[PDB]
Write a protein that binds this ligand. Structure first.
Ligand SMILES: *CC(=O)Nc1ccc(-c2nc3ccccn3c2Nc2c(C)cccc2C)c(F)c1
Ligand SMILES: *CC(=O)Nc1ccc(-c2nc3ccccn3c2Nc2c(C)cccc2C)c(F)c1
Ligand SMILES: [Ca+2]
Ligand SMILES: [Ca+2]
Ligand SMILES: [Ca+2]
Ligand SMILES: [Ca+2]
Ligand SMILES: [Ca+2]
Ligand SMILES: [Ca+2]
Ligand SMILES: [Ca+2]
Ligand SMILES: [Ca+2]
Ligand SMILES: [Cl-]
Ligand SMILES: [Cl-]
Lengths: 5, 236, 236, 5
């Protein structure tokens, strides 16, 4: 999964 | 609600304790109570609200993905019939996730966004609105899926418009917003080229502004820039 | 209760799904429902029950320790007065922990232990009884602390007596019981010499019986023996 | 903390 903040 | 009898300051204090103890459901309940006092939130308090719900919904999302994968495998050729239980339990988790998203969106709509006039607070809340509609979109399969997606898009876009006008390109809130909206494009809107373009432009414009920053601000901005780079590497 | 309308087999199936999804509160609720159907539990089902509650109470214990440490620091010389909130929140977590322990002990008393006649099941349940009284003892500070400690001791001792008569010295249940009763002696009963003696004798008697085992049973027994050794190393 | 199972 891609990075989110 | 249940926190109506507790002082605002005590709710904030206990949210910080709950964070230290990794009790994120408690943390979220305390911060919901704090919001419902009706006063605006400080920067630190907005951060506590976001951390609490991010951790709660994050665990729900991870569980949902596990269950969805089992369910998908159960519907393959040659899979033995095991009855309604996998679907039922996936639905249980899904409903709880949707409930948490609805709670957060309810706090933003009643009345955090409308009283947020400074660019930093308004962008912060609109980013949250986009994120929690995105989480609803991840599990949506029916006739409102398009409208859920458009709600996320609309919130992110308003946040982007404000951030570009009012914040420097290295501002961490602006960077995190762009990171997440880029993921929305890739994973939800079926727009990988838009995702890639946004991540690249965001990275490059931040790079060009780093020279203006203190050591401490530089550290913060470059950390988030690395997340943009990580996604670009995953996608190219 | 709330699970009264769900089939026993469906509750077990969903407990396994909850384990895979790391949803241990759900897992525990499903297994409580399964116990309340009134039938005895198989080996696999007893394991599911224990895993679920171990994980729930384990998280509560970790949180309690964090909060207790903050509270202790607040009562040191030179510490600034911060009001009742730390104590209140520690008490909240403590009460929830005690509730989980009371739930487990209630299932054992109504009616798992009394219907358990085979040595393996009876020992398994009595070990649980000892463990959950031990967790109550960890947070006890009042006039019933001695009686709580004695309840743990009594349950462990009955389990030990049965295990020594009916099980081989390499049996994993026997080994795990001894491991935990040894920790009871060290951490709860203020008897470090008894703790050390029990761990050493258990280890040595298991070592001497390993020659009787298959490759797979050997692996299982030696894993637990290593835990005994680890504690001995910590304590000597 | 010591090991338990
Ligand atoms: C009030 C304010 O400025 N808040 C704020 C909150 C979080 C961050 C933040 N710093 C970092 C560093 C590394 C990774 C993630 N991260 C943050 N998370 C975050 C971001 C970057 C944007 C929006 C929301 C969040 C939670 C800030 F720098 C500043
Ligand atoms: C029915 C039965 O025999 N059950 C059972 C359950 C758990 C274990 C077990 N194996 C291992 C290996 C490594 C570490 C811990 N561990 C176990 N946990 C355990 C033990 C050793 C004793 C009592 C209760 C538990 C949960 C078994 F080998 C067998
Ligand atoms: Ca007040
Ligand atoms: Ca079934
Ligand atoms: Ca649904
Ligand atoms: Ca292209
Ligand atoms: Ca039935
Ligand atoms: Ca206070
Ligand atoms: Ca108490
Ligand atoms: Ca000695
Ligand atoms: Cl269910
Ligand atoms: Cl409290």
């Amino acid at each position: 999964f891609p990075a989110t903040v | 609600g249940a926190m109506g009898s507790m002082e605002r300051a005590s709710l904030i204090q206990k949210a910080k304790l709950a964070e230290q103890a990794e009790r994120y459901e408690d943390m979220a309940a305390f911060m919901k109570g704090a919001v419902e006092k009706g006063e605006e939130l400080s920067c630190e308090e907005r951060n506590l609200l976001s951390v609490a719900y991010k951790n709660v919904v994050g665990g729900q999302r991870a569980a949902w993905r596990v269950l969805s994968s089992i369910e998908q495998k159960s519907n393959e050729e040659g899979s033995e019939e095991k009855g309604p239980e996998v679907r039922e339990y996936r639905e249980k988790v899904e409903t709880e996730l949707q409930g948490v998203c609805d709670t957060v969106l309810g706090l933003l709509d009643s009345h955090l966004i409308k009283e947020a006039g400074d660019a930093e607070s308004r962008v912060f809340y609109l980013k949250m609105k986009g994120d929690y509609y995105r989480y609803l979109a991840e599990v949506a399969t029916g006739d409102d899926k398009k409208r859920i997606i458009d709600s996320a898009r609309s919130a992110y876009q308003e946040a982007m418009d404000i951030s570009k006008k009012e914040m420097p390109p290295t501002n961490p809130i602006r960077l995190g917003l762009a990171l997440n909206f880029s993921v929305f494009h890739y994973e939800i809107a079926n727009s990988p080229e838009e995702a890639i373009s946004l991540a690249k432009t965001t990275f490059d414009e931040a790079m060009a502004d780093l020279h203006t920053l203190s050591e401490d601000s530089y550290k913060d901005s470059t950390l988030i820039m690395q997340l943009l780079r990580d996604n670009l590497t995953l996608w190219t």
